[PDB]
Amino acid sequence: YEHTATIPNVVGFPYKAHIERNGFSPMTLQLEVVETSWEPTLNLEYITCEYKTVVPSPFIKCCGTSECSSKEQPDYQCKVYTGVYPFMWGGAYCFCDSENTQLSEAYVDRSDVCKHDHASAYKAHTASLKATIRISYGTINQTTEAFVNGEHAVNVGGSKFIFGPISTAWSPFDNKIVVYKDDVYNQDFPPYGSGQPGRFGDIQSRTVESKDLYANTALKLSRPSPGVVHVPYTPTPSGFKYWLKEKGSSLNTKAPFGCKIKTNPVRAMDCAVGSIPVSMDIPDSAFTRVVDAPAVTDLSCQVVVCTHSSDFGGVATLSYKTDKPGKCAVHSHSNVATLQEATVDVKEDGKVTVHFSTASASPAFKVSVCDAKTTCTAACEPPKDHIVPYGAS
Amino acid sequence: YEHTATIPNVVGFPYKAHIERNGFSPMTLQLEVVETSWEPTLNLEYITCEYKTVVPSPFIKCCGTSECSSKEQPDYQCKVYTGVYPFMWGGAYCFCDSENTQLSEAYVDRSDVCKHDHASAYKAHTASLKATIRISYGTINQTTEAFVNGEHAVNVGGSKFIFGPISTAWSPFDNKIVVYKDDVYNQDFPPYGSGQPGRFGDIQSRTVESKDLYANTALKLSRPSPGVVHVPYTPTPSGFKYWLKEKGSSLNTKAPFGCKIKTNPVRAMDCAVGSIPVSMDIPDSAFTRVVDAPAVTDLSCQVVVCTHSSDFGGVATLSYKTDKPGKCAVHSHSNVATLQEATVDVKEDGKVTVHFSTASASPAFKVSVCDAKTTCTAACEPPKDHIVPYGAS
Amino acid sequence: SVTEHFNVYKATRPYLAYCADCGDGYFCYSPVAIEKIRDEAPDGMLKIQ
Amino acid sequence: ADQTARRGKVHVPFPLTNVTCRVPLARAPDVTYGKKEVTLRLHPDHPTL
């Protein structure tokens, strides 16, 4: 009750295969592919937003200087214009013109827009898949979820799927996956506080909302205006706003390899590549017996017309000598052809009309019309167009 | 102004570097390392505990049987004892034992202590070390910690320190590590949902408040005893309590690689694995001046006594004639040797005794003591004990 | 009925259980039954129900 | 007699939570370092891993 199959990275083409369970007919399981998610091992460094220069007005230490301090402000620069008689805006309040000190100080911190406004640079690790198998096995049909790696004994409804992992790095990940909140950005950041002025995320935050935090700013003060006070702290170009300017077309927009950027637990909707195993641990007692089945015989091939072409569709037929009417298998044992239908109801004494096809260049239908195999042939003529979603083989 | 090194990355080693450039004085420094917990990219599997079979007071239908049904339990069964001829202890339904149908059900629900009473099996992926870089750069002394991967920032006093990537992935993070209460043990899980009877982790666990917990415990119901109808569901024993009993030798406790293993912030730290790479952007203020040094002239080193051995002990007399006191930093290339002291008083007219370890009995320490270098070598004393705290070679 | 526990004590008037071997092997409703075991403890903690 | 029920519920006494443990890990045996080796002779105690 264990088959071994391969579902590739294109999901939604019906992965239909006759399981030859001896004593029974070859039961076509038709499988449906929902998601893949890439989901790399991220861990955020800095969410870097615009920094904040908190600086009130300075001490006009009049009748002398003013005694400034260095308390370790994070953008703490002291503009001590000592020997600066700052000629105040409504008078010479520093009546010491020589006994006047324009001594100010300024401090800086991480600006408080990061309560909704983070942009988390998740450092990247390995990632996985996330599968959603539709099964159509016997009279069983359902659509459930399973793990991406082989270690999920993917169990529900009679059916386990032990499906070996996406064997190559289906890479939806960069080495510094900056999730700028609703989008990816592959970019190398600096470290936690390990940035420079104008580095992408100039504040450095290995703590997301934690109190202290690194930064590489453009803190440069100034002496005041001619007599009237001017706070001369002239900043650097704010690299959080530079990262606002640095919000390019993301990896979700930039996914080669058919990639789909999926949401916040940053995954891969449309993991648009790969080959995947499946261990089908399904109960074979669901599969109908040979003497529990309808005795279709008289296998012959008689095709009609198949195109360039699209989804399988090609309307041909096969001879059928049925021990009763029944609903037997039809499906090929061969990759040259693609059945648009898989399982065929055949009321007895006749033939089956089967719509299936592929690019019929040196093609032959190896259609195991479930009771017996039919080695038919098809020289599938080319159609016209070049716009549609799906394929042939 | 930026040197680089890589020291023995076990905790319990004084690193030191006596690097000075031209005109900067001889920049001795002594760094130390503290704990560096391993904790790889782990993903929890099953939350194994025991069961509890919900067995109701079952309906003995009198004058007829009982209607069967689907249960939908955690391991739910519903055995209709057909012909449940009731002869209850002061009366059952068996006025008709012939029309008596003893339907009894039981649905195996969870261990109720599972809110902290759990056990996870983290499938382990990659991780790193976390280094408590104690520093004494020149004389700027403190201790900081870092996520010890190769690009983590080091604001060591304003000095730059990058703690480089060590080449040791040999750590206690194996392919799978089960964590119980304080329980480290490298334990492997089953197919998470296809649990083997007798599995430490038999009933699966997607999450600590997870949605479904499938498992293979064999609740064996039969036709019970005749009139005092028993609860004839016979459960399969769990290996949840048995794998508590099979929680053998500890993860850190049976840890090779000398790592300190420990709970939830999953500490595998101070291991005997890997070194500490580093790049030290040295300040200008770390070396002394070019004429800023004392006039230390006519040095000559002579060993006084030599060790086996453990920690420093081996005494050298170094007759520093000197113009002023200072800091003789001693770290010339004694690769079989070590320092007992780090910065000695560069003393005017003093035969400066320097402690120094070295294990090779004919050790020739290239003594580069802060004024200059000579080759000081002699016989180390033969050692004494076979147990000590540490070593120097 | 746990703010005073007697509300839960009054909701559940107790009855005898399948006391199968109270003597040697005498079986009936046993007045002091063995309902459940509450011992998941590393505190050496049995509980009888 | 009911195969069809409507139950009433009550709580669980003695809820298990974290505690310490006064564990008597006494002194181990005597350790002489030898010619390339060392040896501790453990005495008897309670049955110790």
Coordinates of C-alpha atoms in Angstrom, one line a residue, chain B residues 61-389:
Chain B
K61 CA -30.1 -0.7 25.6
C62 CA -32.9 -2.7 27.2
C63 CA -35.5 -4.3 24.9
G64 CA -33.2 -3.7 22.0
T65 CA -29.7 -3.0 21.0
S66 CA -27.8 0.3 20.8
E67 CA -27.3 2.3 17.5
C68 CA -23.6 2.5 16.5
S69 CA -21.9 5.6 15.1
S70 CA -18.7 7.4 14.3
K71 CA -16.9 8.7 17.4
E72 CA -14.3 11.3 16.3
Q73 CA -12.2 11.0 19.4
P74 CA -8.4 11.5 19.9
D75 CA -8.1 7.7 19.7
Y76 CA -11.9 7.3 19.8
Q77 CA -13.6 3.9 19.7
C78 CA -17.2 2.9 20.4
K79 CA -17.7 -0.8 21.0
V80 CA -21.3 -1.9 21.0
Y81 CA -21.3 -5.1 22.9
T82 CA -24.0 -6.6 20.8
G83 CA -26.0 -8.9 23.0
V84 CA -24.8 -6.9 26.0
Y85 CA -27.0 -9.0 28.4
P86 CA -27.2 -6.7 31.4
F87 CA -27.3 -8.1 34.9
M88 CA -26.4 -4.8 36.7
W89 CA -25.4 -4.6 40.4
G90 CA -28.8 -3.5 41.4
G91 CA -30.2 -3.6 37.9
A92 CA -29.0 -2.9 34.4
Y93 CA -31.2 -2.5 31.3
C94 CA -31.5 -6.3 31.0
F95 CA -35.1 -6.9 31.6
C96 CA -34.3 -8.1 28.1
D97 CA -30.8 -9.4 28.1
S98 CA -31.7 -10.7 24.7
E99 CA -32.7 -7.2 23.8
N100 CA -29.7 -5.7 25.6
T101 CA -27.0 -3.9 23.6
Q102 CA -24.2 -2.6 25.7
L103 CA -22.8 0.3 23.8
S104 CA -19.7 1.7 25.5
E105 CA -17.3 4.3 24.0
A106 CA -13.9 5.8 24.9
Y107 CA -12.0 8.7 23.3
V108 CA -8.4 8.9 24.2
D109 CA -7.8 12.5 25.2
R110 CA -4.6 14.2 26.4
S111 CA -2.5 14.4 29.5
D112 CA -4.1 17.3 31.4
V113 CA -0.7 18.5 32.9
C114 CA 0.4 19.5 29.4
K115 CA 0.7 23.2 29.7
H116 CA 4.2 23.3 31.0
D117 CA 4.2 19.5 31.5
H118 CA 5.4 18.9 27.9
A119 CA 8.5 17.6 26.2
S120 CA 9.6 19.0 22.8
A121 CA 12.0 17.3 20.3
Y122 CA 13.8 20.1 18.5
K123 CA 15.1 19.0 15.1
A124 CA 18.4 20.9 15.1
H125 CA 19.7 23.0 12.3
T126 CA 22.7 25.3 12.2
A127 CA 23.6 28.0 14.9
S128 CA 26.6 29.9 16.2
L129 CA 28.5 30.8 19.3
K130 CA 27.9 33.8 21.6
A131 CA 31.1 35.3 22.9
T132 CA 31.5 37.2 26.2
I133 CA 34.5 39.1 25.0
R134 CA 36.1 40.5 28.1
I135 CA 38.6 43.2 27.0
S136 CA 41.5 45.0 28.4
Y137 CA 42.7 47.0 25.4
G138 CA 45.7 48.9 26.6
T139 CA 44.2 49.7 29.9
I140 CA 40.6 50.2 28.7
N141 CA 39.1 47.3 30.6
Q142 CA 35.5 46.0 30.5
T143 CA 33.5 43.0 29.3
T144 CA 30.9 42.9 26.6
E145 CA 29.1 40.0 24.8
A146 CA 28.2 39.5 21.2
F147 CA 26.4 37.2 18.8
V148 CA 29.7 35.6 18.0
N149 CA 29.3 35.2 14.2
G150 CA 32.1 36.7 12.1
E151 CA 30.6 40.1 11.3
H152 CA 29.2 41.1 14.8
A153 CA 30.2 44.6 15.8
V154 CA 32.6 45.2 18.6
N155 CA 32.5 48.7 20.2
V156 CA 35.4 47.7 22.5
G157 CA 35.9 51.1 24.2
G158 CA 35.4 52.9 20.9
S159 CA 38.0 50.5 19.6
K160 CA 36.8 48.3 16.8
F161 CA 36.7 44.6 17.5
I162 CA 35.1 42.1 15.0
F163 CA 34.8 38.6 16.6
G164 CA 35.5 36.4 13.6
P165 CA 34.0 33.1 12.5
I166 CA 35.5 30.1 14.1
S167 CA 35.7 26.9 12.1
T168 CA 34.1 24.6 14.7
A169 CA 30.7 23.3 13.8
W170 CA 31.5 20.5 16.2
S171 CA 29.0 21.3 18.8
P172 CA 26.3 19.5 20.8
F173 CA 23.6 20.6 18.3
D174 CA 23.2 17.2 16.7
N175 CA 20.6 16.1 14.1
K176 CA 17.9 16.1 16.8
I177 CA 17.8 17.1 20.5
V178 CA 14.8 16.5 22.8
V179 CA 14.2 19.0 25.5
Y180 CA 12.2 17.9 28.5
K181 CA 11.7 20.1 31.7
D182 CA 15.4 20.8 32.3
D183 CA 16.0 17.8 30.0
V184 CA 18.7 18.0 27.5
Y185 CA 19.1 14.7 25.6
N186 CA 19.8 14.3 21.9
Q187 CA 16.6 12.3 21.1
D188 CA 15.1 11.5 17.7
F189 CA 11.4 11.7 16.8
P190 CA 9.0 9.5 14.8
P191 CA 6.9 10.4 11.9
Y192 CA 5.1 13.3 13.6
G193 CA 1.6 11.9 13.4
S194 CA 2.4 8.3 12.6
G195 CA 3.6 7.4 16.1
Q196 CA 4.9 4.0 16.9
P197 CA 3.5 2.1 19.9
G198 CA 6.2 2.3 22.5
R199 CA 7.5 5.6 21.2
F200 CA 9.0 8.2 23.5
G201 CA 6.8 10.7 21.7
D202 CA 4.0 8.3 20.8
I203 CA 1.1 10.8 20.6
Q204 CA 2.3 13.6 18.3
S205 CA 2.4 17.3 19.1
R206 CA 2.3 20.1 16.5
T207 CA 2.4 22.8 19.1
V208 CA 2.3 23.4 22.9
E209 CA -1.3 24.4 22.4
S210 CA -1.4 22.4 19.2
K211 CA -4.5 21.5 17.2
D212 CA -4.3 17.7 16.9
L213 CA -2.2 15.1 18.6
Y214 CA -2.3 11.8 16.7
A215 CA -0.6 8.7 18.0
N216 CA -0.5 4.9 18.2
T217 CA -1.9 3.8 21.5
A218 CA -4.0 0.6 21.3
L219 CA -7.2 1.0 23.3
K220 CA -8.4 -2.6 23.1
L221 CA -12.2 -2.8 23.7
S222 CA -14.0 -6.1 24.0
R223 CA -17.2 -7.7 25.1
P224 CA -16.9 -7.1 28.9
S225 CA -17.9 -9.1 32.0
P226 CA -21.6 -10.3 32.1
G227 CA -23.7 -8.4 34.6
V228 CA -21.3 -6.0 36.3
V229 CA -20.2 -4.9 32.9
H230 CA -16.6 -3.6 33.2
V231 CA -14.8 -0.9 31.3
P232 CA -13.3 -3.4 28.9
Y233 CA -11.3 -0.9 26.9
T234 CA -7.7 -2.0 27.4
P235 CA -5.2 0.7 26.5
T236 CA -1.8 0.2 24.8
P237 CA 0.9 1.4 27.2
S238 CA 2.5 4.7 26.3
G239 CA 6.2 5.3 26.1
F240 CA 5.6 8.9 27.2
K241 CA 6.2 8.0 30.8
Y242 CA 8.5 5.2 29.7
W243 CA 10.6 7.7 27.7
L244 CA 10.6 9.8 30.7
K245 CA 12.0 6.6 32.2
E246 CA 14.0 6.3 28.9
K247 CA 15.2 9.9 29.5
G248 CA 18.6 8.5 30.1
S249 CA 22.1 10.2 30.0
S250 CA 22.0 14.0 29.7
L251 CA 22.5 16.1 26.6
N252 CA 25.0 18.4 28.1
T253 CA 25.8 15.7 30.7
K254 CA 26.7 13.2 28.0
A255 CA 28.1 16.1 26.0
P256 CA 31.4 15.6 24.2
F257 CA 33.3 18.6 22.9
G258 CA 33.3 19.9 26.6
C259 CA 30.4 22.2 26.1
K260 CA 28.2 23.5 28.9
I261 CA 24.8 22.4 27.7
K262 CA 21.6 23.7 29.3
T263 CA 17.9 24.6 28.9
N264 CA 15.6 26.7 26.8
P265 CA 18.0 29.5 25.7
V266 CA 19.7 26.4 24.6
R267 CA 23.1 26.8 26.0
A268 CA 26.0 24.9 24.5
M269 CA 28.7 27.3 25.6
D270 CA 32.4 27.4 26.6
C271 CA 32.9 24.4 24.3
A272 CA 36.2 22.8 23.5
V273 CA 35.5 23.7 19.9
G274 CA 36.8 26.5 17.7
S275 CA 39.0 29.5 18.1
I276 CA 38.2 33.2 18.2
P277 CA 39.1 35.1 15.1
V278 CA 39.2 38.9 15.5
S279 CA 40.0 42.1 13.8
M280 CA 41.0 44.9 16.2
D281 CA 40.8 48.5 14.8
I282 CA 43.2 49.8 17.4
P283 CA 42.9 53.4 18.5
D284 CA 45.6 56.1 18.3
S285 CA 45.3 56.4 22.0
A286 CA 46.2 52.7 22.7
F287 CA 50.0 53.1 22.0
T288 CA 52.1 55.7 23.8
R289 CA 54.1 58.4 22.1
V290 CA 57.3 58.0 20.1
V291 CA 59.4 60.1 22.5
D292 CA 56.4 59.6 24.9
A293 CA 58.0 56.4 26.3
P294 CA 60.3 56.3 29.3
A295 CA 64.0 56.1 28.3
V296 CA 64.3 52.3 28.9
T297 CA 67.8 51.3 28.0
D298 CA 70.2 48.4 28.5
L299 CA 67.7 45.7 29.1
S300 CA 68.7 42.0 29.5
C301 CA 66.4 39.2 30.4
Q302 CA 67.5 36.3 32.6
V303 CA 65.2 33.4 33.8
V304 CA 65.2 32.8 37.5
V305 CA 63.2 29.6 37.8
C306 CA 61.1 27.6 35.4
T307 CA 57.7 25.8 35.7
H308 CA 56.3 22.5 34.5
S309 CA 53.5 23.4 34.1
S310 CA 50.2 25.1 34.9
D311 CA 49.8 28.9 35.3
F312 CA 52.5 31.3 34.9
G313 CA 55.1 30.8 37.6
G314 CA 58.3 30.9 35.6
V315 CA 60.2 33.9 36.8
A316 CA 62.5 36.0 34.5
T317 CA 64.6 38.8 35.8
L318 CA 64.8 41.5 33.2
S319 CA 67.3 44.3 34.2
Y320 CA 65.5 47.3 32.8
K321 CA 67.6 50.4 33.1
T322 CA 65.0 53.1 32.6
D323 CA 64.4 56.8 32.3
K324 CA 60.9 56.6 33.7
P325 CA 58.3 54.0 34.8
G326 CA 55.9 52.5 32.3
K327 CA 54.3 49.4 31.0
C328 CA 56.5 46.7 29.7
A329 CA 54.2 44.6 27.6
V330 CA 55.8 41.2 27.2
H331 CA 54.1 39.4 24.4
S332 CA 56.8 38.4 22.0
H333 CA 56.4 35.1 20.2
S334 CA 56.6 32.5 23.0
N335 CA 54.5 29.9 21.2
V336 CA 55.6 27.3 23.7
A337 CA 55.5 29.9 26.4
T338 CA 52.9 32.2 28.1
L339 CA 52.7 35.3 30.3
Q340 CA 52.0 35.3 34.0
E341 CA 51.9 39.1 34.0
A342 CA 50.9 41.3 31.1
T343 CA 52.0 44.9 31.7
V344 CA 55.0 45.1 34.0
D345 CA 56.3 48.3 35.6
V346 CA 59.0 49.6 33.2
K347 CA 61.0 50.6 36.2
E348 CA 64.2 52.7 36.3
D349 CA 66.9 50.4 37.5
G350 CA 65.0 47.2 38.2
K351 CA 65.5 43.6 37.4
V352 CA 61.9 43.1 36.6
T353 CA 60.6 39.7 37.6
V354 CA 58.0 38.5 35.1
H355 CA 55.9 35.4 35.7
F356 CA 55.4 33.3 32.6
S357 CA 54.1 29.8 31.8
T358 CA 55.6 27.4 29.4
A359 CA 55.3 23.6 29.1
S360 CA 58.2 22.7 26.9
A361 CA 61.2 21.9 29.2
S362 CA 63.7 23.5 26.9
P363 CA 61.5 26.5 26.3
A364 CA 63.1 29.5 24.6
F365 CA 60.7 32.4 25.0
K366 CA 61.2 35.2 22.5
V367 CA 60.9 37.7 25.2
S368 CA 59.6 40.9 23.6
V369 CA 59.1 43.0 26.8
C370 CA 57.8 46.5 26.1
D371 CA 61.1 48.2 25.4
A372 CA 62.4 45.5 23.0
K373 CA 63.0 41.8 22.4
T374 CA 65.6 39.2 23.3
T375 CA 65.7 35.4 23.3
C376 CA 65.4 34.2 26.9
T377 CA 65.5 30.4 27.3
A378 CA 66.5 27.9 30.0
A379 CA 65.4 24.7 31.7
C380 CA 61.8 24.6 33.0
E381 CA 61.5 22.8 36.3
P382 CA 59.9 19.3 35.8
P383 CA 56.3 19.3 36.8
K384 CA 54.6 18.0 40.0
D385 CA 50.9 17.2 39.9
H386 CA 48.7 15.4 37.3
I387 CA 45.6 17.3 38.4
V388 CA 45.6 21.1 38.3
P389 CA 43.1 23.8 37.1

